[PDB]
C-alpha cells in the first residue's frame, strides 16, 4: 500500500467563481459570494469541486454509457480512480483530491500589490430590455491555489493507466473551466505541478 502525493499550485486564468450559497449581504452587494475558508476568510477551491469536475470531464472524454443515470455507471477506470458506490461492486477512490487553499505566496503577492483576492464582477441580465443587476464574487485573475492529490496504489500494475487518466483529466480541466459560469468565461484555470512523491510505500514516483 503506497500513498503517492501530487503537490502543486492551481492558478486562475479568467476568474474562478465557486459559489458559497449566498449569505448576509447589503443590498446591491455580495449577490453571490465565492466559497471561502472560514478560518482565514480566504477564497478556497474545494476539493469536491475539482474532483467532481475532473470526474465529469473524464467521463465525457471516455464516453458516457447510453442513458446513464448515476455516477456509479462511469467507465471502469474512472470508477477505480474516483470511486464507486455500486451495490456489491464498491471500488475505493484512489484519488483523494483535497481542498486547494489559497497559496501564501500568491496571498502575499496580492497584499503587496494592494489587490483584493476576489473581484466583485457587476453584471446583469437583459430581458423589454430590462436588466437584472448582480455582483458575482469571482477569484481575481492570477491567484494561485495549492492543490494536493493523494493517489493510493490499490493495484501496482494499474498505476500507469490511472496516472495517464489523471493527466488527461488535468488536461481537460485546464482546457475546460472550473466552478460555475464557464460558458461566460469565468472559471478557466491552469495547473502547475510541483513534485510527485510517494510519501508512503515502496512505489517509485520518479517515472510518474
Amino acid at each position: 500500500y503506497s500513498k503517492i502525493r501530487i503537490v502543486g499550485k492551481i492558478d486562475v486564468l479568467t476568474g474562478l467563481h465557486i459559489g458559497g450559497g449566498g449569505e448576509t449581504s447589503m443590498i446591491g452587494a455580495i449577490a453571490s459570494p465565492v466559497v471561502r475558508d472560514p478560518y482565514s476568510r480566504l477564497p478556497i477551491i474545494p476539493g469536491s469541486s475539482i474532483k467532481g469536475k475532473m470526474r465529469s470531464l473524464l467521463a465525457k472524454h471516455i464516453g458516457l454509457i447510453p442513458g446513464q443515470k448515476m455516477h456509479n455507471q462511469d467507465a471502469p477506470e474512472i470508477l477505480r480512480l474516483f470511486g464507486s458506490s455500486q451495490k456489491g461492486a464498491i471500488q475505493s477512490s484512489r484519488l483523494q483530491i483535497s481542498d486547494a487553499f489559497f497559496s501564501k505566496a500568491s496571498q502575499e503577492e496580492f497584499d503587496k500589490k494592494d489587490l483584493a483576492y476576489t473581484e466583485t464582477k457587476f453584471e446583469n441580465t437583459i430581458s423589454t430590455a430590462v436588466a437584472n443587476p448582480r455582483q458575482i464574487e469571482r477569484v481575481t485573475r492570477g491567484a494561485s491555489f495549492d492543490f494536493h492529490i493523494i493517489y493510493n496504489v490499490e493495484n501496482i500494475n494499474e498505476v500507469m493507466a490511472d496516472f495517464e487518466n489523471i493527466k488527461t483529466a488535468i488536461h481537460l480541466l485546464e482546457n475546460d473551466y472550473l466552478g460555475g459560469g464557464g460558458t461566460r468565461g469565468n472559471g478557466r484555470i491552469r495547473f502547475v505541478i510541483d513534485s510527485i512523491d510517494t510519501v508512503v510505500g515502496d512505489f517509485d514516483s520518479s517515472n510518474l
Binding site: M26, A29, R41, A116, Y117, T118
Partner: peptide
C-alpha cells in the same frame, strides 16, 4: 438613494474583506 448606497458599497466590501 441607489447612488448613495453604491458609494457605501465599496467601503463596505473593503471593511468586510479585512479581518
Amino acid at each position: 438613494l441607489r447612488n448613495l448606497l453604491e458609494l457605501i458599497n465599496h467601503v463596505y466590501t473593503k471593511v468586510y474583506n479585512s479581518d
